[PDB]
Structure 1
Amino acid sequence: GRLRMGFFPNATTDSTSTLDNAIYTICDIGSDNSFEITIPYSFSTWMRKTNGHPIGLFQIEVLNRLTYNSSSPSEVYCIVQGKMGQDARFFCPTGSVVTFQ
């Protein structure tokens, strides 16, 4: 099956919307079932608050129903990971907003 995951940078309205104009990636199930999507830096400012405005709207819509057979699952599990790009940078160290353990 296929699955299209898009991303509207800097979006705030949490609502399902056509991803035709959003940065999307179509995922066709095969041997390498891990799919990546990059969001390039998008903000008015040169640097952006670490804990400020959202990164954007993340949506993963179904493109083609997950097919199966007598001995295969009718539904599967998915995991979403996140990391910084090779051009990632952090700038000013500020106070803390939370306490770890």
Structure 2
Amino acid sequence: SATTAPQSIVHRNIVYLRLFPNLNVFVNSYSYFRGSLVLRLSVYASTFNRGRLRMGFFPNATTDSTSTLDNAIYTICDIGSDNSFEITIPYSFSTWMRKTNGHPIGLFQIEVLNRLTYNSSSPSEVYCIVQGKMGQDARFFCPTGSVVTFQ
């Protein structure tokens, strides 16, 4: 939203594999895994709307609190024709293989960099969608019991 300050947060939360439909299935199947994770933010605005948004990610972070992303893996998004920016998170754990359901993937934060601008015939706020998938180096290892029941 245009109202959101040039530093306020538009979205913040701790990311887990289970937060993703496709992945959550593997989470309930395999016990461990490894590889990079890719998140793709798709902001659906009009051809008139313009602005920037920086989304960072602190690997294995647990404290759900807004924090400067200058040192975090971030991606600045400048609205244009291709309004679907991505961000990759290289495998990061103390082990060669990590729990598919255990420690968080990290802190995901999308802060406002430049207020969403608009005009008389354009929206003052737009909708955004965050998707997630595994990298080309993704792997899963041990199959374990189930933690949930699908339908």
Q: What TM bracket, shorter-length normalisation?
A: over 0.9
- Deviation (angstroms), 1:100: 0.0
Deviations 1:44-94 (A, max 9, x none): 000000000000000000000000000000000000000000000000000
The number of residue pairs the alignment matches comes to 101
The alignment-based identity, stated in percent, is 100
Deviations 1:4-62 (A, max 9, x none): 00000000000000000000000000000000000000000000000000000000000
Superposed CA RMSD: 0.1
Q: What's the secondary structure of 1:83's corresponding residue?
A: strand
2:4 corresponding residue in structure 1: none
Higher RCO (C-alpha under 8 Å, 6+ residues apart):
2
Find the aligned partners of 1:55 and 1:42 in 2 and give their Cα distance: 8
Gaps of 5+ in 2: 1-50
1:4 corresponding residue in structure 2: 54
| Greater share of residues in strand | 2
Find the aligned partners of 1:18 and 1:32 in 2 and give their Cα distance: 26
TM-score in terms of structure 2 length:
0.67
Find the aligned partners of 2:83 and 2:73 in 1 and give their Cα distance: 19
Q: Which runs of 4+ in 1 moved over 3 A?
A: none
TM-score in terms of structure 1 length:
1.00
Gaps of 5+ in 1: none
